[PDB]
Amino acid sequence: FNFNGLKGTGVLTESNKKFLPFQQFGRDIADTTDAVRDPQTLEILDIT
Amino acid sequence: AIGKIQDSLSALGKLQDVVNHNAQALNTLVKQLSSKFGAISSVLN
């Protein structure tokens, strides 16, 4: 996958996190991206 | 006298230290991947 620049690998699934209304993606402890927002549909997806 | 033993418990720091020492080495080992070591970047792609 690639999200508007962000390049990575993994399984995308429906999330249950809530970003703030200015944040695009999230990172976990140890600083690795674990959730993104689809620019078009504005839905939060986890990356496993 | 045996009944008093529970009161002194409800100690095991020697057992928690073993868990802590390994958790700290695994947390440090992962964090050392975000270092440039004097290179232009820290990501091989």
Curated annotation (Swiss-Prot), chain A:
Function: Attaches the virion to the cell membrane by interacting with host receptor, initiating the infection. The major receptor is host ACE2. When S2/S2' has been cleaved, binding to the receptor triggers direct fusion at the cell membrane. When S2/S2' has not been cleaved, binding to the receptor results in internalization of the virus by endocytosis using host TFRC and GRM2 and leading to fusion of the virion membrane with the host endosomal membrane. Alternatively, may use NRP1/NRP2 and integrin as entry receptors.
Assembly notes: Binds to host ACE2. RBD also interacts with the N-linked glycan on 'Asn-90' of ACE2. Cleavage of S generates a polybasic C-terminal sequence on S1 that binds to host Neuropilin-1 (NRP1) and Neuropilin-2 (NRP2) receptors. Interacts with host integrin alpha-5/beta-1 (ITGA5:ITGB1) and with ACE2 in complex with integrin alpha-5/beta-1 (ITGA5:ITGB1). May interact via cytoplasmic c-terminus with M protein. May interact (via N-terminus) with host bilirubin and biliverdin, thereby preventing antibody binding to the SARS-CoV-2 spike NTD via an allosteric mechanism.
Gene assigned in the entry: S
Organism: Severe acute respiratory syndrome coronavirus 2
Identification of the protein by name: Spike protein S1
